[PDB]
Amino acid sequence: KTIEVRNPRTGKFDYVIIPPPPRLLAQQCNRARRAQSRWQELGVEGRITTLQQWKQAILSRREQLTEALVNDTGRLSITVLEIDSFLASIDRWCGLAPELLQTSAKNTSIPFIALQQSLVPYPLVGVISPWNFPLTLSMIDTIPALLAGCAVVVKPSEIAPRFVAPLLMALNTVPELRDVLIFVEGGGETGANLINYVDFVCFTGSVATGREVAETAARRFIPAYLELGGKDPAIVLESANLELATSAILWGAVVNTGQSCLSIERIYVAESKFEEFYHQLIAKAHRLQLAYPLVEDGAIGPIIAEKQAGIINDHILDAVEKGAVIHCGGKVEELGGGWWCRPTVMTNVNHSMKVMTEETFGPIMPVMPFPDVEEAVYLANDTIYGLSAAVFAGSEDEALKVARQLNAGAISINDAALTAMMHEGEKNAFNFSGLGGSRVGAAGLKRFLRKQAFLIKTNSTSDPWWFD
Template sequence: MAASPLDHTLIAELDREINSTSGLTVPVIAPFSGQVLHELPTSSTTDVENSYGRARLAQLSWARAGFAHRRAVLLRAHDLILERTELLLDLMQSETGKTRGQAFEEVFQAVSVTRYNALAAHATLKGRRRRSSLPTVVQTRVRYSPKGVAGVITPWNYPLSLAAMDVVPALAAGCGVVQKADNQGALSILALRSAFIEAGVPAELWAVVTGDGNEIGGAVTASADYICFTGSTATGKRVAAQAAENLIGVSLELGGKNPLIVLDDVDVKKAAKDAAYACFSSMGQLCVSIERIYVERSVADAFTAEFAAVVSALKLGRSFDYSTDVGSLTSQAQLERVSAHVENAVSLGATVLAGGKPRPDIGPLFYEPTILTDVTEEMDCFAHETFGPVVSISVVDSDQEAIIAANSSEYGLNASVLSGSTTRAMRVATALEAGSVNINEGYRGSFSSVAAPMGGVKNSGLGRRNGPEGLHRFVNPITISRATGFVQLPRTGQEFAQLTGTMILMAKVLKALRRR
């Protein structure tokens, strides 16, 4: 089945949930067919500002409602997401061109993120006592106060899971959200939001705005108390600069040129299948996708031959069921970028082992998963992110050479190691410069570990989502200390003279007792 199964009445209902008074719309194209999926209402800067005003009022009550209330609401939303799985899958496939299976990964991630934050928020963010350097004299507690309203800027490639990983912890921490959805993923985000609204999240607390980033992106940043951005490194730097002007915090998940190392003790057949998914899931249109493979020489021929065979056998298609392995690119711009990278590499001497061409016979934005060898520094795909179904293979003589090559990048988002030895793989993994490293998996191990932080180093970003670190983004720690009166702290020179000896002795005793 190639035609979108979406009902136009449903689409119209979702579109009405966008905060838009501009009266303007933009066409959103269905990647599978190239036809207009719907006319998306767009927001103005005034719509953004008004959304923040309403969200701030709603946030005051939401924060006061407490952890138990927020937990109950989020757990109801968790159940509603599960009930609406098929609808969410249809929406994501229609908007992004994913396969059914790769769309399901997003639903499962959204469910996992919602459950984690619902259950973890109280334990992570409740007030705690902290030790004083003057025990019994001073008592200190730290409490956490919600920052207010977060601005969330979400891209088109993983609309459901990326929205959940930023919006849900904000809600769990007691914040409101104004989310700038990419036009191509707005329906999926609105459908996710509707589950939370039905579960009990006030509609004004989570606003969704749409439109051109150059027109409304500055307004989203200008009024926020914290910013979450996922996208390109170039845009992320601009967002960070805007946030710095307002002295607000920011978390950025940016670009990657992610490496995979194949050690010489692998099961070649299994490694080839694992590598293929790591490279070509969602047509490589995800920030943690593998774009560089380094394989040790003794298994290079066998791995490369098996990898090429696996990739060539992947089934491309635009079906709304689980019968295909690889879907479509999402936009004409993506198709042009992928084609340009491959053509540039081939013109400069690269060899195509698999793929290397578009497939208009299947759909307007289909491109075959592509393997390149003999990729050199002057080629565009050598160091620059393709963000598409293109991977290069290079042969190395040792794991140390592989580590050096993998780390020779301005990016550091994700990396992968395939090996038959856990000990050896761990040794290599700990030497890699990346925010996450997966062993015998491409990205799903770390991506699905919602209790662990996710983010990048170098030009791949700042801050972390998921885990306690993801919740702490949305709160300000506030220290409250109380003098007990057991001993009066010195205030005059005479009082200091009387107490300094005692305080020095106390410091020595605390060191001996290993008290911090």
């Protein structure tokens, strides 16, 4: 086949990707494996020098990466931020890696047994990345895996694949890296095939597809790191600073047009503040502009995937059919060939609605009151997801008391969606939001290494447990 690629601003097919037949894919993976030994033998310092050289080449060509990513996503401002975030992660991982990969030696509790430890990388890691943040999410696991000494095959989404071209141009300057960081183009089928060739699979995407990757990884007997989305709730208690809360939650709910695993998708507000809160939220939402007709015109980009426009449209109709009230926005519309939805605030909502239970991935703010904290905690936990949450209160201590009862990996306190902006904080997904541990620090780079122990007899008498 080939696959025609839609432009999310114009709606025209304007790019073509070529998915590898099984035989070519097998060959690219084997080439990366042959090259991985030398990559590993370079040592972590050589790998850092190499990644910095690649970083310098990417910077030189930054305008090409920016243009490709604008074409992929239909927006500029977040595009600049993706690029900045990617470049910073290169520097941050390069600064952590030497210490994280240090071998160690120690004596044990048995006087004549000493211990040495080493760390051995998985030779080939497969990354299957999503279309919503094409660059940062194709690279978030790739960079630490490469620094660990793995080769990595990256298969970005067929929906947003243009950004790879300038990354490949930049690799033409870096021969050592170019043989171990491999880009492959294709759809879901190419993703499934890739899992058959690799030693470790990282997948980011929908819960349905992720559960397939889990089952395939287990049948191949390889580890899998999965991040499968969220229905992150915000809880606003009575004592909350409402001016900060409405600004935080608006941002958290509509940044990237809500196309994020980390988007605030459900909002729960203490009954005695409900009206004031949602009225303020609307006022703030109304100020935001669509990036239309030009990319410069506003914060809010188009819905990138056609299929997602249909889901968002469906969630709204389902909500209204069930009685919801739309205060602003609320329409998935075509403009200039692209699909758009404005920041949308709805009330008279509940958990019988898709928009409060299934991932929406849109700029939707459904707001529900609650009579007491136990109900708020119950509603917030009433989900198959468990990625993140936000709790607002007059003090940090009373927000934390609630946050500790939520079944989610990262909880923002008197703020929302903080993990979209910062790297710190070790977290495990709850429920169906993921498996495989955390990305931060020791645990995040060491996912990609097997630990080996060497247990060394240092004396010359019989061990006391032998038969003699």
